[PDB]
Swiss-Prot record, chains A, B, C, D, E, F:
Function: Minor capsid protein.
Recorded consequence of changing T75A: In strain: QB_1 and Qbeta_1_FR
Cystine bridges: none
Origin species: Escherichia virus Qbeta
Name by which UniProt lists this protein: Minor capsid protein A1
Length: 132, 132, 132, 132, 132, 132
């Protein structure tokens, strides 16, 4: 699909924020499309990547991979310009057989999505609580 | 959060299906909670796992990990009982600093979720099309 | 199922006695749920353990394992406090396939319970006579 | 006791079915008494095996071992005769001391039978759920 | 006991403060229950861990082990977010024999608690003066 | 503090008993102040030991260490004089930075003492129940 400005809505804990990511390259050396919420400085922008990899000699499954990396900056320092003090990461890889159907693929995608909005996952990710 | 029957709604390509997963263990040897949409036979059920792992000696980040595995069965065979003929997989790991906040964690969670419903990801996962 | 006070009924040679086992842990290091008839002192209590283990790399089937250990104590000694003089053990191990059914599983369970109430087993266990 | 047709009643998950096992050998030559629900063909019959073994040099305790083996057959194939696609196994060994009493042995036997009819065990064997 | 919000009262030098700890997982990899006083950020919260370990082959006694880790944070920095500058620890392990009684165990428990509230301990701990 | 007859009250399961320990040395070879309850014979007396150790070459924290050792005696024997049949132990060591404060240490002291009267700890120590 068109590497275009993807715009995500009603995210954040309260469900009220917005993220705008702009096309920011393909093909670095490895086919991974890149997006970024453009900020003051490269180190300070939230990134996303997407890469579909066809099956080959060793690879027999298709693998779609998504990566989120969100830096946190703190301007006060022993200096003037803000610095990255931590990163948040997500990393999802999907693995699909060459004989799979789009219905099975779309099920895994929509299932993961609905899962991420569930009390079990809200507690595990937002509060870092295991399950009992 | 209570390892309870999580119920996911309006999933699938059309957005009209439902998934019901029932608590099906914790603590196999590795703290991973398990859920399953209960089906006729173990090999035939859709599974989910969740595991939060505190930081330790080598681990300094928290890592939350989610796994979807959905089998496809075909009953006709050279036999009577259905057999698994492929698996669909998702695998997401989140990586968070000990100094991160729930707002940063909930952002990465809701962002991934909203991302999974976007044209770029619909094409990459459902149609296995890279990005241009 | 809820790791709850199991209570067992009319056991013993006459089938008139009662055993009450109280939840006494999970996960020592190995997922082994534990029960125990509470007694004067830890070494003198009867124990039960159950462990379901899923299939992995090495293990392809499911394995359910139940253990029983009943100490016999004798308070007279060259001492005051009762001491264990022997144990009685039972260790049972069910092995079921990824494709097994709950009917097949319940049959083995109810068969083994019924088999244990039968003349041939009653003589092999209770009087230690083989079979002819 | 007399290796004789043992007949077992209301087994199965509904507790309505009957199993008839016919004496089918003794020794073979590990002392293993054998039984078998008469079947169309040897691979297709449910078996049971009982063995008592006296304490010797290496063995100082008595050990009684009982094994159930139930195959599942499937008539359809790429052939006419039914084939075995899976087995269900139970394997129980009792370990008793030279100084145990018949009352102590009978307690273990009847405890195991009672224990096999309890919610905790029904869920671990029939539904393959661990305990929480 | 149910892993609950344990609430502790009248602690601190003056005996006037309160600490609330919330069940924050079990079984990371080691049967270690966890609790934590809800803090702004993971690295900033007071933790407690409890584990009861049964006797094994290496371990012949029971061992109960409790850990306290309270961090101190200072927000002024060459930064914005508060950082951890030190940790206070308490690590207690109890050791009891298979034949110990609950009265003997509660004596050690209540004796230690009484001991900690005593002039000799107050000066050893709060003022780091040895004894003479 | 002056090594003085410490007296502790309302200890034991019921909270009704009293414990008088008497100064019984210092400086054996290791700065370990020692106490003890008046016992018929040295092997039969409850001991306590406290040691504060300053930071050093290897050691950079202060360490305060307390030990409890309560023997159980059984007078009946193949003898006249009582013999020790088991010991109960508690071993607490606190770890504090050179930069800690008396309020931070007193917090850890009073938190341990309050923790030791809580339903969770009572069940783990007195009844040797883990946590769920």
């Amino acid at each position: 699909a068109k590497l275009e400005t993807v715009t995500l809505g009603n995210i954040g804990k309260d469900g009220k924020q917005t993220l705008v990511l702009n096309p920011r390259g393909v093909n670095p050396t490895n086919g991974v499309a890149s997006l970024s919420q453009k900020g003051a400085v490269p180190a300070l922008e939230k990134r996303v990547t997407v890469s579909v990899s066809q099956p080959s000699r060793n690879r027999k499954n298709y693998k779609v991979q998504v990566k989120i990396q969100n830096p946190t900056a703190c301007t006060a320092n022993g200096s003037c310009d803000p610095s990255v003090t931590r990163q948040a990461y997500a990393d999802v890889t999907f693995s699909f057989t060459q004989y799979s159907t789009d219905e099975e693929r779309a099920f895994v995608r929509t299932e993961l999505a609905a899962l991420l909005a569930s009390p079990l996952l809200i507690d595990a990710i937002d509060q870092l609580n295991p399950a009992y």
